[PDB]
Design a protein around this nucleic acid. Sequence first.
DNA 1: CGTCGCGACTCAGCGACTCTTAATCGAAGGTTAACACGATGTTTCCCGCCTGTCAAGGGGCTAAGGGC
Length: 59
Amino acid sequence: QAITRSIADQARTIRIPVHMIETINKIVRTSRQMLHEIGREPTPEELAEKLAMPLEKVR
DNA sequence: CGTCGCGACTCAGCGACTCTTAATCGAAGGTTAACACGATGTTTCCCGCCTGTCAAGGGGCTAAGGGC
């Protein structure tokens, strides 16, 4: 928890927030699982509904 | 009358900064526990004060035409 709490801040050079880091990690994990099971890379508009979040927020 | 007890000695050894001078084209890949109030900003309208139209009215100044 401390590494994930600190890696999410002092790793991007811009100090991305912890919740945004976890959201982008969830997005990349969903994209990886889709590439592994479904097939080709999904569109960014599809990842918004794949995680049950706003379509504009994922963009 | 020898050496060794005890001292320096310089020799090796080990580390370490630059790669002329202008130029042939711009970006560049990964790492994947879950949730919760709280205090902290973010973003919309909504009136407050104020700013800017053109208009209406008018008068006052300027000037042009007519009469003696």
